[PDB]
């Protein structure tokens, strides 16, 4: 991509996966150096982040919480979209939240923890935003069984 060989090429792991369908680009980024990577992509021209996507390919294996960060603004209209690909596993749900710098990620990271269980830090209130706080298990991951609850059947 553009920023992977210009800005993140100075000692950052911008492991590209090719181009996406229309104009986006997927670049694999590890879970240790992510908040500094988020601040580096923040001070680039890119400001507007939306649609944090937590897809669950390979159930029991790799888990990802990708982004759709672009650089839209008020007067200029240079929409350069990119997917910051962060990855994790079932054994390691530890991922850093961007809620210390990008505070508006409360609902996004809470839904990601609420539907997958991705363990987070630097987050003010990480709670189950759709399920009860007593609820165990996560429905969005493909290796999940909804247990014997009578409200899930008609009978």
């Amino acid at each position: 991509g553009t920023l992977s060989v210009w800005l993140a090429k100075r000692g950052l792991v911008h492991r590209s996966l090719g181009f996406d369908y229309q104009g986006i680009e997927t670049l694999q980024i590890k879970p240790e150096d992510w908040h500094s990577i988020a601040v580096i992509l923040y001070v680039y021209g890119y400001n507007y982040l939306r649609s944090q996507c937590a897809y669950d390919v390979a159930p029991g294996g790799l888990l990802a919480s990708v982004y759709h960060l672009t650089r839209i603004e008020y007067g200029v209209n240079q929409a350069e979209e990119v997917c910051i690909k962060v990855f994790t596993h079932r054994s390691n749900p530890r991922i850093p939240s961007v809620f210390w710098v990008w505070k508006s990620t409360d609902f996004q990271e809470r839904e990601s923890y609420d539907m997958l269980g991705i363990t987070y830090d630097s987050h003010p209130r990480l709670k189950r935003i759709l399920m009860p706080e007593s609820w165990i298990g996560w429905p969005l991951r493909k290796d999940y069984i909804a247990p014997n609850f009578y409200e899930i059947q008609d009978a």
């Binding site: 181009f19 996406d20 369908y21 229309q22 986006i24 997927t26 400001n47 507007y48 982040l49 939306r50 649609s51 996507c53 937590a54 897809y55 669950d56 390919v57 759709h68 839209i72 603004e73 008020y74 007067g75 209209n77 929409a79 979209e81 997917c83 505070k103 508006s104 409360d106 609902f107 539907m115 209130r125 189950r128 935003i129 759709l130 399920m131 429905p139 969005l140």
Partner: protein, 356 residues
């Protein structure tokens, strides 16, 4: 610091939500929005259903304007398969999408003016649903979006009622425009709230009326060349007064801009119902495609990772108003219990696309 419960049956009618605040005195200072009330699990079932089976499912998101949801979820596979839509059906789709934007903003300002009446807007709404009945046949539960365009054709009465809608509707709109200049209770009861600027609304997450409230001419369909938007008359609201009445002028200008687009598209007519229909059943591909459209609340989005099967492998929706719900924790700091009604009105949100 008496904790408000903020129960399910609100004194207003704008959905079911939870906004527990410590409220030291009458000043609200700390917001904890609890959600999950109107929840369906759209993503996992959409992974378990096809496009023709989750295509009846796109009605429970922004049901005050149901054309936007099915429009973006059919424009997904059209640009995914690279199947060309003819100009006639695409322009009629533009007309009905702007009419649904009209319906969304008037069905916002109806109950908003009821909280802060119903037949002052229902005189228009009966002819609006007559247009929906002459367009597709349902009131708001239409299923008429195909890959080639509209599933049916326009009848010979709907084009005449569409010609009559302009001088049926714009006159009562401009009779409703002068009320905020006349009536000072809107100059004193909703005036003031909405203190975010442009460099901050770009900074957090905002889009739609909260981004155009600061005087930014923002538009997805102007930046992205989509449905020939530069042919029609456009005036995106660069109103920089910031507050809630600035948002009301934003919504009046968006309705009037859609009126200008439809009025220029009354006599356009540049072309069949569905192009590329050999077979009733098809599949989808596997690409990295995020499609978005200009929502009335700001950048509704569909994320798609394909499976090359009958089911999509990943189906995540970015709703506009749920990203727009993030800013109230910051727009709660120095207001009142008599102000949060105006706040949850000026967010312009229903809980269909929130929990989903």
């Amino acid at each position: 610091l008496m904790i408000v419960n903020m129960g399910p049956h609100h004194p207003s009618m704008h959905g079911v939500l939870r906004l527990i605040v410590t409220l030291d005195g009458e000043d609200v200072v700390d917001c904890e929005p609890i959600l999950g009330y109107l929840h369906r699990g759209m993503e996992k079932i959409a992974e378990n259903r096809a496009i023709i089976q989750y295509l009846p499912y796109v009605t429970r998101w922004d049901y005050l304007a149901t054309m936007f949801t099915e429009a973006i979820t059919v424009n997904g596979p059209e640009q995914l398969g690279n199947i060309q839509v003819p100009k006639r059906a695409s322009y009629i789709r533009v007309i009905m999408l702007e009419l649904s934007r009209i319906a969304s903003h008037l069905l916002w300002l109806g109950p908003f003016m009821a909280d802060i009446p119903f037949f002052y807007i229902f005189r228009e709404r009966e002819f609006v649903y007559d247009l929906f009945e002459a367009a597709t046949g349902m009131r708001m539960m239409h299923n008429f979006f195909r890959i080639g365009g509209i599933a049916a054709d326009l009848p010979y009465g709907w084009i005449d009622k569409c010609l009559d809608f302009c001088d049926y509707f714009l006159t009562e709109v401009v009779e409703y425009q002068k009320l905020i200049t006349r009536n000072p209770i809107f100059l004193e009861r909703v005036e003031g709230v909405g203190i975010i600027g442009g460099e901050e609304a770009i900074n957090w997450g905002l889009s739609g009326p909260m981004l155009r409230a600061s005087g930014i001419p923002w538009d997805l369909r102007k930046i992205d060349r989509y449905e020939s938007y530069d042919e029609f008359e456009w005036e995106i609201q660069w109103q920089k007064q910031g507050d809630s009445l600035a948002r009301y002028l934003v919504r009046l200008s968006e309705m009037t801009e859609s009126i200008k687009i439809i009025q220029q598209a009354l006599e356009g007519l540049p072309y069949r119902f569905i192009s590329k229909k050999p077979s009733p059943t098809f599949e989808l591909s596997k690409q990295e495609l995020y499609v978005r459209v200009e929502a009335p609340k700001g950048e509704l989005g569909i994320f798609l990772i394909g499976d090359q099967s009958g089911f999509p492998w990943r189906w995540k929706i970015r709703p506009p108003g749920f990203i727009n719900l993030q800013i109230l924790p910051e727009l709660v700091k120095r207001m009142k219990l008599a102000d949060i009604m105006t706040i949850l009105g000026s967010i312009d949100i229903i809980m269909g696309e929130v929990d989903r």
